[PDB]
């Protein structure tokens, strides 16, 4: 009871980090829309989880890369739970490999799911955010999006591009009191620690904590920021 | 009741931002030690405030620049409320002017109150933090410490130096599960908005929110970070 | 006579910044390949310029977005002038507008010309660079790619993504002594200054200077960096 | 013959990195003033070196920490070689140790030699720079000043503070066409490589290259920047 029945849309909330985010957001009192590729099993399992502990949630199988199968999905969300106050872009495909083994298949998959998706969902929710004078957009940006990483040029470019998006949107909506920030997780279980000063993996609910903080009113004057959750990895 | 009766030490908690921090930390259920230069009136007024709404607090007039009048103050705190889990370095003097009008008086005042103080308090609390395997150190770093500012070379250098301290400590204590992070407030009332995208000043309790988040268990995997609260100013 | 007859490939060297880069690189004694969309007039005018003052140069009309019409172009370059030592990615389309007026046409044009192109050219030159133990890749990254910009979410995302690419490649090739860096120009004539501390536009040959430095042996231990040429704009 | 007989002042140019800088600056055709603690032997050896290969140079034993024994030194320089166009702050003491073993002796030595010195020399040269409408100030900022380092909290704070100084001065002098930038060297021989992607130490003349570039007219639109020379270490 800290989100006050607001509506959160978590793309790629199917599983893992997104699942922790959806669970957390719901437990703070927000109706969560779970958008996914996706296996429907994990998604309705996530919703069943949110409901089991008394939270409001819905699921939406959507292609985040389609220019607006997204819009269909978004005003479906708006119809079902109401206008979006919180948008979490977590949809993303990983396809590693040296920049010379990288392929258009890999490249465009990664780029469309990790970067384009955010563009299209932000496009969909943009006039609502503005007409409301409130809003918190949270993009998932990888620590490899902050300082790069070998053999992940395609994923890392997508995540860095996501950070650029975050900044530009934040500047774009700042005067209409709509915030946009980025989250840069490091090494996270679940499914090496040398450059990680804390010498341990992170848990998803630790990332979920940061998403929840960025989504609430405690971060009302924070916008355009890139916050790592990496155990100090990319400090 | 979210700090669980832990102990927070807020240097420069006399007034303004520090006061909002002390108030906030206390309201989340932490015994707060208010360390100040300082006018005692505002400090015991802050404590009287914390107490009035049922919080635990003490005041300590200390010179943050003395090499260890600080230590006296710190184990006074430890004697009175207990070992420190949360350390907030907010002590700081501002003395503006073009780098050629800057004076040793100004320079050393700013540098000792804004930078040295943090060094000495971190020195004091350092073995406690380590022996406990827990800890959250929050340094106040100005947005002018992030991208500089004209006519504030002396203050800005102090704040940037504070960010360097933050990083080095975070690396230094990471394996013993002690976090260290920096907060970079922008334009904050109370006592021009063109480079501020949100086109408004910030309120102190908005900065206090970020300090509280960085102090709790929601930021347990965050360390070595520099988070602005500037309305997007230094994004 | 400071490039020693090495071979530089400048995509988008048709005109403007790219033209200044090609001219400069040539004047330091490098055979320059001018790759462009492009109007052929400006390109062969650029080559005619390089030749007029005694430099070696060739032109290549290529689609930087085609997955490898690029490769055809690149081993054309290799056939004509020799293996590439210096790669400058300057190809880029600008299509501004609020993130809700942004269109797939705009979006994919910007993203493919500004980001994908770099991927494909780096792909093409990658084994040459490695087999040689030398190499300097210079990506053009905008200052709007560093801190974002309103109404340029699509361009800014592309440029930030370019910075992520730069980092990942630098890490990827570092051990084989191949450098990769990014250049972030600010406001540049030729064809407002408030956030620009120097209170003036930049000239293209000033950016060209930085490209030339990053291309030579004076920057042999510099890699993975993002250097602004913005009059302090994004400091 | 690329500095055109301008005057460069290199504090801590006694030895090592500073020596490479003084040598390099001189070879590009600049009269170099070698300011040092210092052993006079190495300094006049450096000058003897510059002279041996036909360069103009002078030496000045000065306490960079004295508030203005510095000024005496600076208008000595001005008397001997002429007004300063280039200022390189390289004076610095290193005294490592965990933040709890750090001592006022250590702390103030490091802070005064690494940070205060820059303040005082910039103070001395500031009206000359302004009256001339030209100028390049180069501060040496360590890579540990960029992302911190364990057991070097005191040195790292000094170097980060140096970066803050750089920014503030750059903003402060930008309109009078005086540039200020920072150099962040990584692991440099002469007198472990895991976080260094290039898997090798750097040579001093590689850092000297960057200083020379930042000192000339090739970087005329670059100001307020922090450029690493670390083999990608702090990318």
Author numbering:
A (entry chain A), B (entry chain A), C (entry chain A), D (entry chain A): 5 to 195, 206 to 249
Paper passage:
However, a recent study has shown that, in the biosynthesis of a symmetric polyketide dimer SIA7248, a trans-acting KR SiaM iteratively reduces the β-ketoacyl intermediates attached to different modules of the PKS. Here, we report the crystal structure of SiaM. The overall structure of SiaM resembles the consensus structure of KRs involved in the fatty acid biosynthesis as well as polyketide biosynthesis. It harbors a Rossmann fold which is responsible for the binding of NADPH molecules.
Although there is one SiaM molecule in each asymmetric unit, it forms a tetramer through symmetry operations. Superposition of SiaM, EryKR1, TylKR1 structures indicates that a variant form of LDD motif (IRD) can be found at the same location in SiaM. Instead of pointing towards the active site, the Arg99 is positioned towards solvent. Although SiaM crystallized without NADPH, the superposition of SiaM and other KR/NADPH complex structures indicates that NADPH binding cavity is present at the same location in the SiaM structure. Close to the NADPH binding site are the catalytic residues (Ser146, Tyr159, Lys163) that are conserved among KRs from various sources. In addition, a water molecule is found in the vicinity of conserved Lys163, which was proposed to be involved in the proton relay. As a result, the Tyr111 is located in the vicinity of the Phe123, which form aromatic stacking between them. Similarly, in the other interface of the tetramer, the aromatic stacking is found between Phe227 residues from neighboring protomers. In addition, Tyr235 inserts into the binding pocket in the opposite protomer and forms hydrogen bonds with the backbone carbonyl groups.
